[PDB]
Structures are given as C-alpha cells and as structure tokens.
Curated annotation (Swiss-Prot):
<comment type="subunit">
    <text>May form homohexamers. Interacts with N protein.</text>
</comment>
<feature type="domain" description="Macro 1">
    <location>
        <begin position="1"/>
        <end position="167"/>
    </location>
</feature>
<comment type="function">
    <text>Responsible for the cleavages located at the N-terminus of the replicase polyprotein. Participates together with nsp4 in the assembly of virally-induced cytoplasmic double-membrane vesicles necessary for viral replication. Antagonizes innate immune induction of type I interferon by blocking the phosphorylation, dimerization and subsequent nuclear translocation of host IRF3. Also prevents host NF-kappa-B signaling. In addition, PL-PRO possesses a deubiquitinating/deISGylating activity and processes both 'Lys-48'- and 'Lys-63'-linked polyubiquitin chains from cellular substrates.</text>
</comment>
<protein>
    <recommendedName>
        <fullName>Papain-like protease nsp3</fullName>
    </recommendedName>
</protein>
Length: 167
C-alpha cells in the first residue's frame, strides 16, 4: 500500500491520473519523481521547467554542478539527483526530442531506467514539448516498465484520450 490517490489502474504495475506532477509530488513526497530532462540538464520548460521552478532553482544549481563534473547525459539515459522539496530523489530521464530529430526508438531505452526503482511518480516521456505521440509513449511505458509507475498527465483532454484509447 502507498499514498498515491485517485489513479486509474491500467495494468498490473501502471497507474495514471490527470494531475500536475508538481502538485502531485508536493502532496505525496514520493521516493522518486521523474523529470523529463535533456542531456544538458537545462530545465527551461515543460515538466523540467515546472519542477525546477518549484524547487526555487535548486534543481538547476545541483544539475549545473553535475554536468560540470560528469558531462552531458545520453539520450535514453538518466541520473539520480536530489528530489529537493518534491521527493527524496529525482530521476532525470532523457527521452528523445522529436523536435531535435532524435530516434524515437530510444524511448524504450529511456523507460528502462524506471526499472531501477520500485515505485515512481512520472510524466509520459517524450510527450509535450519533446514532440512524440503521447499515446505511443504510454504504450512503450506499459510494455517496458515492470516496476510500479504512477503517471501524471497535466492536460485533462489528453488524459481522457489516453484512457479511452488504451488497449
Ligand atoms: C502528455 C503531456 C506531457 N506534459 C507533461 O508531462 C507536462 C508538461 C508541463 C507541465 C507539467 C507536465 C506539470 C505541471 C507544469 O507546470 N508543467 C501531459 O502530461 O499533459
């Protein structure tokens, strides 16, 4: 039993809700919140900009030190950093950004990072400003993640379409 509330169960291990991931994280304080990161950990907009703003830019400060030490992530890769005031940890995961021409096949590799964590609060990878089809992202999530994932979908219209079209 966990404290995630109001989710629709899609499969044995995948759950979904129409919610703002920032407000969800502040309420639940999950062990892991997933960020929709880019390889530079530049948290300018989308989910990343919102999560970072909620940390009063502390996420960006920590991320800049991470990059200065380690260099950029790989598309499809991840790193674990602090969750600041939102969660114990933040798993920064880089899905492919279609608006940069990146290979959508890397979406499966991106979701594989979730399997290193027993329970996660997460957005749909490569959705929103990353330009991929969110219906496809949900399909890849369900077919790749085996650990317990709680998906927050900001857009109510999109949430209803994701549920209604889910096979
Ligand atoms: C399928 C799409 C992808 N978009 C996101 O995951 C997303 C985008 C921007 C923000 C948030 C989530 C949280 C609150 C916020 O301030 N910004 C959806 O979830 O609606």
């Amino acid at each position: 039993v966990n404290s995630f509330s109001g989710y629709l169960k899609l499969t044995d291990n995948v759950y979904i809700k129409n919610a703002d991931i920032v407000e969800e994280a502040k309420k639940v304080k999950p062990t892991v919140v997933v960020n929709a990161a880019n390889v530079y950990l530049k948290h300018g907009g989308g989910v990343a900009g919102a999560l970072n703003k909620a940390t009063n830019n502390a996420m960006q400060v920590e991320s800049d030190d991470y990059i200065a030490t380690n260099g950029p992530l790989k598309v499809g890769g991840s790193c674990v950093l602090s969750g600041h005031n939102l969660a114990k940890h933040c798993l920064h995961v880089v899905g492919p950004n279609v608006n940069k021409g990146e290979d959508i096949q890397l979406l499966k590799s991106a979701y594989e990072n979730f399997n290193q964590h027993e329970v996660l609060l997460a957005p749909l990878l490569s959705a929103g400003i990353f330009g991929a089809d969110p219906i496809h992202s949900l399909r890849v999530c369900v077919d790749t993640v085996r650990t317990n994932v709680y998906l927050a979908v900001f857009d109510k219209n999109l949430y209803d379409k994701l549920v209604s079209s889910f096979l």
